[PDB]
Amino acid sequence: ALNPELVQAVQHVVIGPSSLIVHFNEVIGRGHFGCVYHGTLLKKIHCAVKSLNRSQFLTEGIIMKDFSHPNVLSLLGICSPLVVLPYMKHGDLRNFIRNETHNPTVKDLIGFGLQVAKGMKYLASKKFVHRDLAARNCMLDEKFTVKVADFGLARDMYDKEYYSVHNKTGAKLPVKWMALESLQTQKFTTKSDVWSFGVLLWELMTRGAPPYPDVNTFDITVYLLQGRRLLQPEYCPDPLYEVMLKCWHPKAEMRPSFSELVSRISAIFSTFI
Ligand SMILES: COc1ccc(Cc2nnc3sc(-c4cc5ccccc5[nH]4)nn23)cc1
């Protein structure tokens, strides 16, 4: 009953069950949409396997297979729908920077943001809008390479604390990361991803502080419309805060592209020893 065209299209993405061992005995992540487990891929390859709840839309998900970039979470393959992802040793970026045992420098933190910018520049060039860019939704591998994650079949609410439900609709949205226009229309664009990226930069430069702590969530609109923005973090260089303010331009079309952001951030990064 499957579209035969869809069938032969996904072959380059399908992983044979004889080639994947899933270690269900070790839960590494619980999500709203499924659990992540350790896995072995056949040489032997260590991976994370996400097991979704409750078919054609799953196999169509292989738009994800066609995304390949050093700073974007790759899809190893698919095989209960099994999402086979590369193992990310150092977990989500927000938890990593909040970890007191780790000691990233200012240059390192700016480096993490430059990596996210490159990943988004890639995603944007494929006309992919993320809609939930945040430090909690980026991951770090064993070489401390940052991967924009939490998209496609990997999409989930990995920290429910930061999603609030709207009235007219039912949507639980990451309001503290959303652009003004998205708060008002609930539509998302690459330029609204740029707003979120500005917030992510602030997260990095505060080592994972929650944005707008006092503010009670969906009235963030009123807060911003008072003429407000997140404050400059103590160790944030002045030009990087100017970049943040640009990311939060009132007019979406006046915000920088991710291409411009990679360019500007690479220059700032380069001034550090
Ligand atoms: C250990 O390696 C992985 C690899 C992929 C995944 C699934 C995934 N894809 N994108 C994202 S963001 C994310 C995440 C987990 C988490 C836990 C606490 C707070 C924030 C979090 N984000 N997980 N994830 C989970 C663990």
Q: SS3 letters for 105-129?
A: CHHHHHHHHHHHHHHHHHHHHCCCC
The answer to whether 175 is a known ligand-binding residue is: no
Task: Please state how this structure was obtained.
Answer: X-ray
CA 91 – ligand 1 centroid, Å: 6
CA 139 – ligand 1 centroid, Å: 7
Tokens 């099994």 belong to residue = 82
- Cβ-based burial of 55 (10 A; exposed 0-12, middle 13-18, buried ≥19): exposed
* Entry resolution (Å): 1.9
- Contact (Cβ atoms closer than 8 angstroms) between residue 64 and residue 109: no
Pairing of strands 77-78, 82-86: antiparallel
Furthest C-alpha separation in the chain? 60
- Contact (Cβ atoms closer than 8 angstroms) between residue 123 and residue 196: no
The answer to whether 246 is a known ligand-binding residue is: no
| DSSP secondary structure of 24-40 | EEEEEEE-SSEEEEEEE
Looking at domain 88-273, which CATH architecture does it have?
Orthogonal Bundle (1.10)
**Residues within a 6 A CB radius of ligand 1:** 28-29, 36, 48, 50, 73, 85, 87-88, 92, 95, 136-137, 139, 149-150, 154, 158-159
CA distance 63 to 39: 23
How long a stretch of residues is the chain? 273
What are the beta bridge partners of residue 30?
35
**Range(s) for CATH 1.10.510.10 in the chain?**
88-273
CA 92 – ligand 1 centroid, Å: 6
The single residue of 66, 108, 132, 156 carrying the catalytic annotation is 132
Q: Which atom of ligand 1 is nearest to the CA of 94?
A: 20
- Contact (Cβ atoms closer than 8 angstroms) between residue 162 and residue 136: yes
| Closest-CA residue to 265 (of 241, 249, 248) | 241
Token pair belonging to 222: 């009123």
Whether the CA torsion 123, 141, 107, 97 is positive or negative: it is: positive
- Contact (Cβ atoms closer than 8 angstroms) between residue 255 and residue 247: yes
DSSP letter assigned to residue 75: P
| Closest-CA residue to 176 (of 190, 159, 189, 154) | 159
Q: Which atom of ligand 1 is nearest to the CA of 149?
A: 10
For a mutational test of ligand 1's pocket, the pick from 93, 139, 153, 163, i.e. the residue with the most ligand atoms closer than 8 A to its C-beta, is 139
| Closest-CA residue to 132 (of 219, 207, 196, 88) | 196
> Angle 190-205/238-247 helices, nearest 10 degrees?
150
| Closest-CA residue to 269 (of 96, 146, 105) | 105
The answer to whether 36 is a known ligand-binding residue is: yes
The answer to whether 33 is a known ligand-binding residue is: yes
Q: Is 132 tagged catalytic?
A: yes
| DSSP secondary structure of 142-188 | TT--EEE-S-GGG---S-GGG-EE-SSS--EE-GGG--HHHHHH---
Tell me the CB-side half-sphere exposure of residue 41, using CA atoms within 13 A: 19
